[PDB]
Curated annotation (Swiss-Prot), chains A, B, C, D:
Pfam families in the cross-refs: Copper-bind
Localization per record: Periplasm
UniProt-recorded Gene Ontology molecular function terms: copper ion binding; electron transfer activity; identical protein binding; transition metal ion binding; zinc ion binding
Name the record gives this protein: Azurin
InterPro entries: Azurin, BlueCu_1, BlueCu_1_BS, Cu-binding_ET, Cupredoxin
The gene coding this protein: azu
Length: 128, 128, 128, 128
């Protein structure tokens, strides 16, 4: 089974998927994020951030407040299972994480923490 | 706190929200669904269906198969916590359900079961 | 034929339609805009603004620069055929305009001028 | 200036852009379409089709009727300025066309002609 996904965030406040499936046979999983938009990261930056559903709101809320200089993530935030850096137009970044960090019966959300984006830039991540 | 939400499904494969919050002080909760599109229910029907996240895929899969005559829900499907009827252009329908049917620590999804719509017509429902 | 449309802008950077049809038999046309989101107008304000397609970019660009105090429209901007005020959570506003302001063979765009929203909050308006 | 764009259509009824700009200095322009979804072309096929805004509705309407076997385009449809083939999960296709086929003062639409998709799978194409 494939153990990676390519994700884009654009100038229209959108990721190109709202649902990621990680096959239970994967040992690692890689997200390759790119920004095919034209706007710079100070006005339209995106990241890809994974947390439990229960933790999403706190990660987004604390992240928003940290500013462009912290990639809109609270420093030393243990709620963050895995994440990319914040990118703007023409940039890309990849994150690989150990699938053993995910459990069944738990449900996960991915999202961007740039101010206000998560209302549309969010989706589910699930083992199967 | 408010204990109802107005939801629309349109001709563009979209609900007008992807996240519903039910205040923990509500005893009942009402969803008022409408279809401001122009297309009829045989080609662009929508419903609003609530289940646990774990049950969503089975409800959608079994529902799809039941046809326009069953409102695209498997008969006697106990996985369905609450739902509206399937509606087309110009129609509306409301459902009220007991908030005691929802628990904390559990996470819920709403979605439309008309064939293929749930890939975009879906969102989270959470107590708070 | 109907000569009005109800439009919503939400917390997810979206209008609930991307295509408005004005029947050629209408003498006036009314847009009723509402904001069913929770965010205030300083962070998630929306308006509904009509212009020719050729004029859209200049209206959006000049509008962005005018600030919350000008409802993000350049004062005395003759390019604006019709528009609502800028609204935030829980507010609504209606605009009525004369259909004789529109021509056939010309093509029109509607959009929100709040900073950056028009990349997703836009659509076509056409006589038929 | 760049004279190509990469476009995706997914399982969620979406292209990853709603606005294409063709630089006036381009002599040719290339669209590279891919389908990163999982669904096959009989249920979730996509193409990329360019026409004038005035011609869009007729191309979509006549195209819909032609069936999977005709890639949902009416044979010998002179309204089609350029187009890709219809693709499903895991497929890709590119089209190159002469920029001299486009004029200023005219306004263009791109869209998918698979049944009903164009309500969301559409956008503008403009010279600049
Ligand atoms: Cl979701
Ligand atoms: Cl458009
Ligand atoms: Cu494998
Ligand atoms: Cu973002
Ligand atoms: Cu109350
Ligand atoms: Cu539906
Ligand atoms: Cu009338
Ligand atoms: Cu807006
Ligand atoms: Cu060049
Ligand atoms: Cu399509």
């Amino acid at each position: 089974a494939e153990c990676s996904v390519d994700i884009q965030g654009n100038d229209q406040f959108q990721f190109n998927t709202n649902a990621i499936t990680v096959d239970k046979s994967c040992k690692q999983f890689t997200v390759n994020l790119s920004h095919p938009g034209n706007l710079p990261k100070n006005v339209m930056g995106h990241n890809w951030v994974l947390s439990t559903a229960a933790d999403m709101q706190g990660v987004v809320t604390d992240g928003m407040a940290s500013g462009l200089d912290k990639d809109y993530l609270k420093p030393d935030d243990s709620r963050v299972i895995a994440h990319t850096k914040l990118i703007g137009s023409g940039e890309k970044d990849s994150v690989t994480f150990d699938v053993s960090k995910l459990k069944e019966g738990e449900q996960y959300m991915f999202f961007c923490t740039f101010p206000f984006h998560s209302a549309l830039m969010k989706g589910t991540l699930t083992l199967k």
